[PDB]
Symmetry: C7
Subunit: 205 residues, 7 copies
Amino acid sequence: RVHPEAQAKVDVFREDLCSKTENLLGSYFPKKISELDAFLKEPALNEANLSNLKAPLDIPVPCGPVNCNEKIVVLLQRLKPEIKDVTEQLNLVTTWLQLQIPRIEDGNNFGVAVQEKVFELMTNLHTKLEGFHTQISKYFSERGDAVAKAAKQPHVGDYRQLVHELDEAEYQEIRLMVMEIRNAYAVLYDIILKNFEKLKKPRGE
Amino acid sequence: RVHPEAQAKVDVFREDLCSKTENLLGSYFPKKISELDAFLKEPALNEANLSNLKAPLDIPVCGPVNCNEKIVVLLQRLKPEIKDVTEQLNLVTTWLQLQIPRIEDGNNFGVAVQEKVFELMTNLHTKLEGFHTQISKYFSERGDAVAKAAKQPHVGDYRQLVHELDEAEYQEIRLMVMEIRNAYAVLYDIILKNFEKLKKPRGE
Amino acid sequence: LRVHPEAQAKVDVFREDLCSKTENLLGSYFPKKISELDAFLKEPALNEANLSNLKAPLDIPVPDPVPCGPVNCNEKIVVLLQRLKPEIKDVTEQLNLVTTWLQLQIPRIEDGNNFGVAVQEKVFELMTNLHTKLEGFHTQISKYFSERGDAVAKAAKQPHVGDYRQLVHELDEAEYQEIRLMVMEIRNAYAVLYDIILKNFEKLKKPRGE
Amino acid sequence: HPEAQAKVDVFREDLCSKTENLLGSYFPKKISELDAFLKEPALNEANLSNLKAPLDIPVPCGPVNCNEKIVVLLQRLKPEIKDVTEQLNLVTTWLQLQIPRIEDGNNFGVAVQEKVFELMTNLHTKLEGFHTQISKYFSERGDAVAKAAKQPHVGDYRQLVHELDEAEYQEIRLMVMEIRNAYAVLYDIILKNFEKLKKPRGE
Amino acid sequence: VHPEAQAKVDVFREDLCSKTENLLGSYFPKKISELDAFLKEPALNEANLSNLKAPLDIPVPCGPVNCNEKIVVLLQRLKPEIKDVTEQLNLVTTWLQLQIPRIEDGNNFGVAVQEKVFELMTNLHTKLEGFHTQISKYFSERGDAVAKAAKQPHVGDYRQLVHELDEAEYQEIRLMVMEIRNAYAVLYDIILKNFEKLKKPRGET
Amino acid sequence: TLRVHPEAQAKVDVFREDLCSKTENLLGSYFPKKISELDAFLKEPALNEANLSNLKAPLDIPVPCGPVNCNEKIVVLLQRLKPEIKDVTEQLNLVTTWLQLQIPRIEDGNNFGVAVQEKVFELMTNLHTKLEGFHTQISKYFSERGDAVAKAAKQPHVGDYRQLVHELDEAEYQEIRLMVMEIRNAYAVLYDIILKNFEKLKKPRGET
Amino acid sequence: PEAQAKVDVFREDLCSKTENLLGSYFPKKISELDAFLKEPALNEANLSNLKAPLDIPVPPCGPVNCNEKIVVLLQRLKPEIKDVTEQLNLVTTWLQLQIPRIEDGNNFGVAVQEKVFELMTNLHTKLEGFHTQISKYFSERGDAVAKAAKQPHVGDYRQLVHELDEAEYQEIRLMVMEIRNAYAVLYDIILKNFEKLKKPR
């Protein structure tokens, strides 16, 4: 049993979470899909040739301070807030679906079977999207090791190419992250609307 | 075969464990959800600009480089929240294991409800395993970047690496607060709904 | 094979010693351990109101823009570890004793009357899951001093980095919370084993029924 | 709620117009392009020894360059990996939005989509490994060239650098074949099953 | 198939059958009483965990640091006990595989009895393989710990670590004697109970 | 239903005809030739050594150090081995794709023809798992033999590092031996299962 | 065509090999190996007698020889490892060519082959680890001897070298046992099921 103020706090949280998820679904998701579609179409993520990304690598070949790649860093400043929201909004929507699961009763509860099927997808997206924050910190750590190795031993030509190839790979990774983040919204937005009857009220009322 | 007096002190454990779980779930869980919803709404975990977070990194392009102040103040509030949720999860998990009746052939749906609720508690436990070690990993990873930046000042990536770990750590605190809020919320939800079958699966 | 009249004496004396142990163990040892560990949780040694009270003196000379003294291990954690180490010893030995008892209670394999066997297999499934947890606790204490020693040694080597001093303090804060989890886990391991065995003891000892 | 159907359907109709045009024109084009690229004398040499880059280390140090004959092939391979991973990722999402409302019983039209979706996931496994291996190649060769110069008295490190090149030539040749086969397999399975993939229920 | 070749193989089956029945009859009962007696000796029942601590002679601002003599004398007794059980397990496993009859259509239950008893033998083989290389890891880890203590004498944790590894290896050697005792006891139990079906699974022909 | 351009559609059908025309000539001519060529290569005295002491690469370190060469006897075998791994991995990938194009429309009825293809395709994955590891095997050998020779030169007093280098050569010889056996068996087993099931692989549903 | 001949000479060569192989080689190898175990080389009464002379001044140091008593056993082990892995691979491939056309239903003759083939995969999983562990031994001993000479004050690195020697000796005893049991189990299961393996339909 719960006393009335306890039941108030949880039910206010449910209606706050419902009020968000309904609004989030209606406005935020279409807007985000349109924004990320346009962001892919911009000339920043449509580099005709990948050689123009090649940052200046100042090392004396037989060392001066070499800053990081500017053309990648500016894209990471736009990507980092776009990763932030999906991880929150997916986690918000996932939590909403968990609270919509009714009491566990006998038989082939098909409304529950639909919820678990939609919930299974939300776990699969959560697998893909969790990797991206560490992959930004990984890039600078891996590039820092490559730039240091190039400076430590300038006679090895591969360590110079390594720093340029990590930049070309990171550019492609960032464009995949935006595409995945666009398609994460689009698939969620589609699958929830299609099954919204059974997700909200699985048994019927 | 058991001695009556030794049996009695095990019955005291179950009674206080049941007396905890009711009073605990009744007040502690709603209160924690309200507090962690408020904590997410505060301006500490709603930094409008991520550029405002980046702490001073003093290395001559050697003076002492401090830890990021604004992350340590948040970690001081987060650490007691991780302690509590993992304690109360472990508490409730144990209560549900003792509610499992004798393993019999007939009348096992009440048991099957407990096993599905117990399945969720292990999945939360799996998520809340990582938060213990996460804080020690951050200072180890950040220190390594600060040391590498000081050891080799010509590499600009190690300077960026330290600021990026601070941005990544801030967001990881943000997700951890949400996860602990949602951990309480989902536990409260499922136990409150299924409380009839969890406490008394067979009936009686 | 008919073995040997004295050979069966070796095994059945072990069987009866294990049956005498497990029955006496279950009745008297488990309730004592659950109450002792509940009392140990209640004690102020595992109820630090502030964790910064545990902070060990980390004496390293901090440099400025113009060798080390002896850095000790955390006293307040080590005293708790010396209390936990015999508790980990006991539960792993008694779990291994009880798991062995249950395996010798498994009857000769028939295709029919196998429900009583299926009860034992479900109880054994839990004992396997406890063995998974408590095997990890033994090497955790070694890993604490290993990781702290690495942090302390390296904080001394690079004293300009402030994160490593904080790291050593955070390992002590993390280790304290970890120890408190282990005492709970070990209390709950005794509590859960006692419950499931006492409830199902009819089918565990005599599965076919007699 | 009903406006939400207009915004989501316009995106589906946009993604349909992209995918259907792309699948008809782009996939046949790419298969002929990559099949021709394999038949070129760049990817077919009579002896693998001609790749062998000049490795100048004083045997008892000067600058050692990368293998030029591999680098020029990597300049042609990198845009091909970029494209196929984007179009596969696009087609994956097109199939996910075609999945109808989840309804009771074993409806076969959905099972066709899941069978085709399993293949797209299996191709996704192969094509993800291609991206990071190019960075891995230069890292491993950079370690080998450094180690060879560090200790010139060992002959194996001299041989290692040549072997990484001759192996990378083989790896680049497979990656072109795999990406050619990825287009061919996707085109074949979607074209055949297009009736059930687009309209599984049939209204 | 050849005449005298058959003789070379069936003598090995006779040798393995004669080994197993004599082994199971006398060796296993003996090993259980001996290993239980080992566990009750005062070497493996140290009343206080401080007494096992070895002298760690390093100057705190290097001289020879010996191995823990109380653990080394225990390892001299444990090593042959590991050797014996790992061999007799591997012998008993092979005997059971040769008792598997021809694979006939459908399901015969006598074969399912063998596969259930065989499943346990492979599960025990997993446990007893870990014991062999863990002794080499103990000395490798203690050597590293002592070397780190000697290289940095200002660090008090490395001193503790070396005493913690000795406390852990004592309590590990404690379990390894119990596990090998329990391996014999469970193997004797399961084979003696099911011997009718293990030896002759299709009944008497 | 999808509409594709008639010239674009003509481009793909030519690739199907290229793969079927290759596979048909490839399966009949190349595979039995390769199996007999590899069986001969195993029988040659290069790959059969009773005495493994002859392999010993003369390791010169003063018990500053002079040049240590690779094992010449292994390197000459690797020059013959590398083009064999090239071909079998390419021809496997050719035939693997030929199965995937032969998979008909996913239908409710008459699915045994499809189950035959999926069983044969299952083997072609298991071979692809084994034949992947042979590619990087050679890179690992010279990398590990180098590290062994470098350690031996760095620390001459340890006699085990000298033995290590000879033991990697003996292992690599017995490895190369095995990898030629596997590639012969890969050609043999593919030829067997494809020839036996060819009716159901090519035309699974029936004839139209 | 004439290419069909090339494969049929290879198949009937493999079928001729497998009958000669199984009929003589496997019985001989089981007896040969079981004799190996009975010899006093692998039956050391006390493990302390294998302890190699570890000469380090308790940094400059003299030559530490490899363990002679383990190396002589490794000279005998290596040719026995070679043989099993080659004959296992020969027999595995023979069984794969014995697999008939994939026909409808669930023909049990095929199911017998698949069960016997499953065992040959499990033995292969066991034996591939034996090959690289000899390289692992000298690599791990070489590092342990180096660490002992580098830092002579550490007593554990001296003990570590003698423990690898005892551990390797015991590992060679098991590798011979496993190789004996690999031939014995293969001979048993193939000979028992030979009717269904050769002609399943």
